[PDB]
Amino acid sequence: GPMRVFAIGNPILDLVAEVPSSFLDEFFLKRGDATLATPEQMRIYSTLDQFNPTSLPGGSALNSVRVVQKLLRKPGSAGYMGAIGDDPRGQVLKELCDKEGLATRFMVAPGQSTGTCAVLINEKERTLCTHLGACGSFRIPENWTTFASGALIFYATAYTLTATPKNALEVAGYAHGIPNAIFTLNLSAPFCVELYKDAMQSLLLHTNILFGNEEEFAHLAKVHNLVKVALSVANKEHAVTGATKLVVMTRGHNPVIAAEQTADGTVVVHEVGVPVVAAEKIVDTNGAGDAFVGGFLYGLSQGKTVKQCIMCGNACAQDVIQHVGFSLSF
Ligand SMILES: Nc1ncnc2c1ncn2[C@@H]1O[C@H](COP(=O)(O)OP(=O)(O)CP(=O)(O)O)[C@@H](O)[C@H]1O
Ligand SMILES: Nc1ncnc2c1[C@@H](I)NN2[C@@H]1O[C@H](CO)[C@@H](O)[C@H]1O
Numbered sequence: 024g025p026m027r028v029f030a031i032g033n034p035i036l037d038l039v040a041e042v043p044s045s046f047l048d049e050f051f052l053k054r055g056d057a058t059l060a061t062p063e064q065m066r067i068y069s070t071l072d073q074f075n076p077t078s079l080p081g082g083s084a085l086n087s088v089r090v091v092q093k094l095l096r097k098p099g100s101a102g103y104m105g106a107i108g109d110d111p112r113g114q115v116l117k118e119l120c121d122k123e124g125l126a127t128r129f130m131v132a133p134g135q136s137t138g139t140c141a142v143l144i145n146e147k148e149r150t151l152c153t154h155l156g157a158c159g160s161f162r163i164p165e166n167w168t169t170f171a172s173g174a175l176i177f178y179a180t181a182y183t184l185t186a187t188p189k190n191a192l193e194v195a196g197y198a199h200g201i202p203n204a205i206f207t208l209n210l211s212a213p214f215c216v217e218l219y220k221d222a223m224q225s226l227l228l229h230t231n232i233l234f235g236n237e238e239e240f241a242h243l244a245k246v247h248n249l250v251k252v253a254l255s256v257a258n259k260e261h262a263v264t265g266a267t268k269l270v271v272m273t274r275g276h277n278p279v280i281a282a283e284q285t286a287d288g289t290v291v292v293h294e295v296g297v298p299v300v301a302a303e304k305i306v307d308t309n310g311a312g313d314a315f316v317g318g319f320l321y322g323l324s325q326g327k328t329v330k331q332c333i334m335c336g337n338a339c340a341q342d343v344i345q346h347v348g349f350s351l352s353f
């Protein structure tokens with residue numbers, strides 16, 4: 024069907040720059056973290072100019088869906104909804120999406136600025152600090168189901184819970200009433216797991232595929248009960264005549280772990296190796312996870328197997344990490 028994947032997310036503009044450790048220190052940032060800017064960090068945005076940054080579209084789910092659209096090629100292969108400000112920045116993101124053939128319906132938040140994220144690279148690690156702006160006012164239009172008519176794969180990032188959990192909840196609920204439809208969710212970041220516990224709980228029950236990195240599940244284990252393999256098998260309970268129930272945990276260069284609960288109750292686990300990539304060849308890890316999910320969703324949509332999906336995800340992520348910031352090559 025026309026649209027294969029539909030997602031909701033926070034459309035944001037990324038400002039990427041390589042900075043010294045001292046910068047991270049002055050802005051109270053922890054290397055490798057992902058957070059929402061505090062008032063004392065708002066100054067990061069203007070101060071980056073001295074580092075000759077580069078700017079490009081960002082937004083986790085948006086990066087993911089762009090990979091899918093890039094791979095499926097046909098216009099409207101992937102659809103996305105989110106909110107942008109009524110500023111020039113928002114227009115730029117929109118035009119870029121249109122040029123890619125992505126199907127979109129952006130809600131404009133009057134008088135608000137489009138979200139921006141500072142992608143700071145130090146060593147070879149990335150730290151993300153975002154100012155959501157307009158993204159926080161996103162409200163799914165009631166006719167979204169029509170716009171996404173035909174998609175069987177629905178995706179949302181936990182990052183979207185900040186605007187309101189209602190958005191992801193409506194997407195999940197709708198996918199649930201559709202046969203052969205699956206709802207997929209990304210834990211997105213530690214802060215998401217920690218702050219949106221109750222909402223996550225209701226969402227997980229309706230989630231078919233849960234994605235996340237080792238760091239994200241650890242917090243999920245703590246926040247919940249259960250407290251690699253065990254954490255992964257643990258999480259499967261939270262989600263738990265066979266509707267897809269799978270958990271996919273990424274772990275940098277370590278093997279990818281995917282646990283699935285089949286129709287009969289049998290739990291099947293897969294530990295898939297990740298091809299070695301020379302450290303000197305690694306540029307930056309910004310967007311590795313997003314590309315992984317994009318490759319994974321693209322493959323899933325092609326009916327490939329769980330192992331094959333992971334392989335496709337690994338391939339996309341490897342390419343992207345050998346480039347500055349995100350990259351749509353392949
Ligand atoms: N050192 C490494 N060598 C090879 N692949 C790596 C890698 N680090 C990450 N990856 C690839 O990227 C996938 C996801 O990595 P990971 O989830 O740890 O990225 P990340 O969370 O930094 C991304 P983001 O910046 O988008 O939040 C891995 O499964 C693997 O395929
Ligand atoms: N809160 C939030 N919401 C959506 N996307 C986000 C963020 C944050 I902290 N970081 N990012 C995006 O994650 C990508 C890296 O995985 C970057 O492109 C960046 O825009």
Ligand SMILES: [Cl-]
Nearest residue numbers: 032033083084
């Ligand atoms: Cl997002």
Ligand SMILES: [Mg+2]
Nearest residue numbers: 275308311312
């Ligand atoms: Mg990483």
